[PDB]
Amino acid sequence: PQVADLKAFSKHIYNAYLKNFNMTKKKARSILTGKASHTAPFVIHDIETLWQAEKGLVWKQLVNGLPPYKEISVHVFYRCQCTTVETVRELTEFAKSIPSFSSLFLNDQVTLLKYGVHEAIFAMLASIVNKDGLLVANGSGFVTREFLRSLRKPFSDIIEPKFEFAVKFNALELDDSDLALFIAAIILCGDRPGLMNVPRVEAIQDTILRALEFHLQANHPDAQYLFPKLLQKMADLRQLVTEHAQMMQRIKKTETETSLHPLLQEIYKDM
Numbered sequence: 573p574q575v576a577d578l579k580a581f582s583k584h585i586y587n588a589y590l591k592n593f594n595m596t597k598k599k600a601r602s603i604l605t606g607k608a609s610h611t612a613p614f615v616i617h618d619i620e621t622l623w624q625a626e627k628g629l630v631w632k633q634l635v636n637g638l639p640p641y642k643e644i645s646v647h648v649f650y651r652c653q654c655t656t657v658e659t660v661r662e663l664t665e666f667a668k669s670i671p672s673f674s675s676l677f678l679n680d681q682v683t684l685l686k687y688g689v690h691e692a693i694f695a696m697l698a699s700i701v702n703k704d705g706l707l708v709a710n711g712s713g714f715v716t717r718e719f720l721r722s723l724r725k726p727f728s729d730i731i732e733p734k735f736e737f738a739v740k741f742n743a744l745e746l747d748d749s750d751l752a753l754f755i756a757a758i759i760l761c762g763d764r765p766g767l768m769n770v771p772r773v774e775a776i777q778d779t780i781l782r783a784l785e786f787h788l789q790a791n792h793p794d795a796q797y798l799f800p801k802l803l804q805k806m807a808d809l810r811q812l813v814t815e816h817a818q819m820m821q822r823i824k825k826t827e828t829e830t831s832l833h834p835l836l837q838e839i840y841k842d843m
């Protein structure tokens with residue numbers, strides 16, 4: 573009974589996932605391993621290739637629309653910020669496609685997203701990352717980790733920890749059906765500050781976590797300790813976002829010429 577209902581519940585969350593995110597992990601790994609295709613990502617590894625990419629690749633956000641140019645490291649930061657805001661929009665529609673999320677009063681929906689999207693983002697980021705770099709422009713480019721390490725502090729320092737997380741997270745070998753549940757549990761989190769209806773959010777969270785528990789038994793039958801490992805990963809993500817916010821505060825304080833998107837400004841006010 574319990575296992576039956578939770579199976580259907582998981583499927584609806586998976587559909588919400590497949591319906592709203594621009595790239596699946598299945599698609600990402602196929603590009604990053606070059607398994608299939610006639611097209612390979614253009615590799616961005618230094619200044620010259622970054623420029624060739626802005627001259628050639630199609631970006632969701634127009635280069636001319638980014639805040640005025642300042643310098644290479646900042647430009648990269650602007651592209652990171654564009655993609656973050658675009659992922660916030662996707663996560664908002666994903667959450668909204670979950671009926672128990674949409675049933676919450678809108679103010680609770682905002683609180684969950686405000687305190688949850690960065691955790692979800694850095695979890696999902698692992699899908700487009702390997703040890704050597706990550707996909708950009710809807711899979712049309714691949715920016716190398718080494719290049720990103722070469723940017724000046726503080727922009728190199730805010731990037732590398734996410735790769736450290738992602739490589740360890742990818743070793744658990746989750747698929748998109750696992751991630752849908754996992755991301756749903758990050759967003760529907762009853763611990764978030766200022767929540768109005770905590771018990772309702774806690775109950776939803778618990779339902780998702782039980783659904784995920786049973787999902788991993790069927791989908792990863794030989795993986796021992798995988799469910800508790802993922803609970804630790806959720807705790808790990810909180811710490812990763814604490815550090816990230818700390819670094820963002822330092823960027824606000826010391827990089828005054830660097831523009832921060834207003835939506836992310838609204839996200840950081842309280843952390």
Ligand SMILES: CC(C)N(Cc1ccccc1OCCCCCC(=O)O)C(=O)c1ccc(-c2ccoc2)cc1
Nearest residue numbers: 648651652653655656659693697708715730731734836
């Ligand atoms: C996490 C995702 C959203 N992301 C950013 C990103 C990846 C890994 C580590 C850090 C990082 O962003 C730290 C800044 C955060 C911003 C503001 C905020 O905190 O909301 C990216 O997908 C991305 C996009 C474009 C590029 C790029 C383009 C040309 O050269 C490089 C590199 C990455």
Ligand SMILES: CCCCCCCO[C@@H]1O[C@H](CO)[C@@H](O)[C@H](O)[C@H]1O
Nearest residue numbers: 660664682685686835838839841842
């Ligand atoms: C699109 C979902 C993500 C939204 C993230 C930003 C949330 O910002 C918050 O919006 C509230 C008004 O609604 C204000 O009361 C808070 O002061 C502000 O911090």
Ligand SMILES: [K+]
Nearest residue numbers: 702703739742
């Ligand atoms: K990897």
